[PDB]
C-alpha cells in the first residue's frame, strides 16, 4: 500500500528520475558557459579546479530515501564527470607544423575512449538495470537497499574510492596533458612524456576488478 501511494502523491520515484537526469541536452549549455569565478553568476546560468558543490531540495516523504550523505556521492560523480567533458570539449572546440595534429589524434582518441567507457558502459548499464528494479519495489526498506546498491557500486566501477594513488592518479596526471596542450596553440618533450605515461597507464592497469578490461584495449 505504501509503495502504491508513493508512485504519485508525494511521487518519490518521479523525483528520483529527475535527480540522475539534471546531471550525468540541458547540462551541455551550462558547462560551455563556464569554459569561457563568481558564486551568483552561476545560479542565473543554471536557472537559465575541483569545486562546484551541487545540492538539491527533497520533501520529507522522500528525505528518508535520498539522505544527506547520499547527496555527496551524487556530487562526487558529477565533479569527475565534468573534468572529462572539459578535456573532451577543450580538445574539440578548436579546428613539424602539422606534427601537432598527430599529437591530437593520438590524444583526442584516448580521452574520447575513456568518456565512452564511463558514461555508456557504466553510467548507462547500471542505470538501465536500476530502473527495471525500482519498478518492482515492494517495501519501505528494500527500496533503500536497491538504491544504496546503486551508488556504492557505481562509485566502485568508476574508480574513485580506493587505489587512487595507485591507478586513479595516473588518469589524473595525464589529464593535465589535456590542459597544457590545450593552451599552447617543447613539442618533442611531450611525446616522451605522453608515450611514457600512457605506457605507464597500461603497464599499471595490466594487473586486471575484471570489468576494467573493457577499456584496457586502449
Amino acid at each position: 500500500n505504501l509503495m502504491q501511494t508513493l508512485k504519485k502523491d508525494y511521487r518519490l520515484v518521479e523525483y528520483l528520475q529527475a535527480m540522475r537526469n539534471f546531471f550525468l541536452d540541458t547540462m551541455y549549455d551550462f558547462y560551455t558557459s563556464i569554459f569561457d569565478q563568481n558564486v551568483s553568476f552561476l545560479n542565473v546560468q543554471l536557472q537559465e579546479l575541483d569545486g562546484l558543490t551541487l545540492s538539491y531540495k527533497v520533501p520529507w516523504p522522500v528525505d528518508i530515501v535520498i539522505s544527506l550523505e547520499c547527496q555527496k556521492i551524487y556530487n562526487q560523480v558529477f565533479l569527475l564527470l565534468l573534468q572529462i567533458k572539459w578535456a573532451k570539449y577543450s580538445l574539440d572546440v578548436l579546428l613539424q607544423i602539422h606534427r601537432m595534429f598527430l599529437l591530437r589524434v593520438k590524444l583526442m582518441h584516448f580521452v574520447n575512449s575513456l568518456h565512452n567507457y564511463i558514461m555508456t558502459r557504466i553510467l548507462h548499464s547500471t542505470g538501465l538495470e536500476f530502473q527495471h528494479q525500482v519498478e518492482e519495489a515492494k517495501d519501505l526498506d528494500q527500496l533503500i537497499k536497491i538504491h544504496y546498491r546503486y551508488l556504492s557500486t557505481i562509485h566502485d566501477r568508476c574508480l574513485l574510492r580506493e587505489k587512487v594513488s595507485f591507478v586513479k592518479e595516473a588518469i589524473m596526471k595525464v589529464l593535465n596533458l589535456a590542459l597544457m596542450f590545450a593552451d599552447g596553440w617543447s613539442i618533442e618533450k611531450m611525446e616522451s612524456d605522453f608515450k611514457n605515461c600512457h605506457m605507464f597507464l597500461v603497464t599499471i592497469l595490466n594487473k586486471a576488478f575484471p570489468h576494467l578490461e573493457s577499456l584496457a584495449l586502449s
Binding site: 541536452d25 540541458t26 553510467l123
Partner: peptide, 20 residues
Amino acid sequence: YPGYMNNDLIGLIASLIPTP
C-alpha cells in the same frame, strides 16, 4: 533528440577529421 554524448555538431565531426 538529446542524449548523453554528442550534444553539438562539432562533437561528431572532429572525432573523424584528423587534419583540416
